[PDB]
Structure 1
Amino acid sequence: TVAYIAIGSNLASPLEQVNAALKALGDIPESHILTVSSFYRTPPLGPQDQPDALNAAVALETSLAPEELLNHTQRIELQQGRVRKAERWGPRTLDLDIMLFGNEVINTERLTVPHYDMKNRGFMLWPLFEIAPELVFPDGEMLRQILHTRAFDKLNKW
């Protein structure tokens, strides 16, 4: 099954963090990196001068069950990032989000797929559209259609 995973960083040299995360994802058992997007720059909201985030998307072919993949992504986040509790409400070292898992719809306390609110997040949809322009969501909505109907500015590359 192809899993689409979002990667975000805005601390401790994001280009390094995203590359470290790609290496870690690529190493997850019975999984293989199919496609990686370009790296996008996501400015902070608000006048406050916080660090920009680097955002990317990866297509990962995997034979793992969805919650098994989550076990690995959470492991990677905890080992590589999540240094301070404050990262929860602010800039963070590494954020790995499972956006989609084939055509699966999953609603558990651990795992919700498609990822919460992802259709309203340009920093997810742009890199996703780069790697899967013909993608259709589990509800039948085309990704391309979402980008023609929702108010997103085009994110610059990193």
Structure 2
Amino acid sequence: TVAYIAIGSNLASPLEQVNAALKALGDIPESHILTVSSFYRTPPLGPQDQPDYLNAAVALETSLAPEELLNHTQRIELQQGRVRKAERWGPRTLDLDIMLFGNEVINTERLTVPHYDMKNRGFMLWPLFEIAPELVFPDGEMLRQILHTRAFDKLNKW
């Protein structure tokens, strides 16, 4: 199998925060680094001030349970996905959501393979477009079919 995971960090370090999930995504048991797009850099929020939204795509070979695979990444996000700051570490900056899970669909109260928030974003589809520009979503949708229908502004590489 193979689950398309994403990577989002709210830090401004040389892949110092992404490196944590990068190796952890491949550290997920029953899987192993199969593919990983490049790191992007979407502009801020506009009115306020959002950091370098480093959005990347991944293609792990996780044969685990969509819920466990979710707990795994989520575990790395909270376990080894937090910034350090003296004796008072920071919040969770490491992000890793299962954009997809091979060719299946859940959409349950606990699961949601067809990343309910990937077919409506302009910073989560591009990364996947760098490894699966023609990703045929489980339900049938196409990553390209969404980028062409919305024409989301491309993002620069971090």
TM-score by length of 2: 0.87
Shift of 1:111: 1.9
Figure out how many residues of one structure are paired with residues of the other and give that number.
158
Q: Which has the higher strand share?
A: 1
Shift of 1:141: 2.0
The answer to whether the Cα contact below 8 Å between 2:82 and 2:90 also exists between their aligned partners in 1 is no
Shift >6 Å, 4+ stretches: 83-91
TM-score by length of 1: 0.87
Select between 74-83 and 14-23 the one with higher mean Cα deviation. 74-83
Aligned-pair Cα RMSD in Å: 3.6
The answer to whether the Cα contact below 8 Å between 2:99 and 2:114 also exists between their aligned partners in 1 is yes
Q: 1:62 to 1:76 in 2, by over 3 A?
A: same
Q: Which has the higher helix share?
A: 1
Q: 1:19 to 1:47 in 2, by over 3 A?
A: same
Question: How far apart, in 2, do the equivalents of 1:115 and 1:10 lie?
Answer: 20
Question: How far apart, in 2, do the equivalents of 1:85 and 1:102 lie?
Answer: 38
Question: How far apart, in 1, do the equivalents of 2:26 and 2:87 lie?
Answer: 25
Q: Flag structure 2 segments of 5+ consecutive residues without an equivalent.
A: none
Q: Flag structure 1 segments of 5+ consecutive residues without an equivalent.
A: none
Shift of 1:77: 0.9
Q: 1:2 to 1:152 in 2, by over 3 A?
A: same
User: Alpha-carbon deviations, 1:73-104, whole Å to 9, x = none?
Assistant: 11101112356999999995111111000121
Question: How far apart, in 2, do the equivalents of 1:89 and 1:98 lie?
Answer: 26
Q: 1:7 to 1:32 in 2, by over 3 A?
A: same
Question: How far apart, in 2, do the equivalents of 1:91 and 1:51 lie?
Answer: 15
Select between 91-100 and 16-25 the one with higher mean Cα deviation. 91-100
Q: 1:52 to 1:91 in 2, by over 3 A?
A: farther
**Match status 1:13 vs 2:13:** yes
Q: 1:87 to 1:125 in 2, by over 3 A?
A: farther
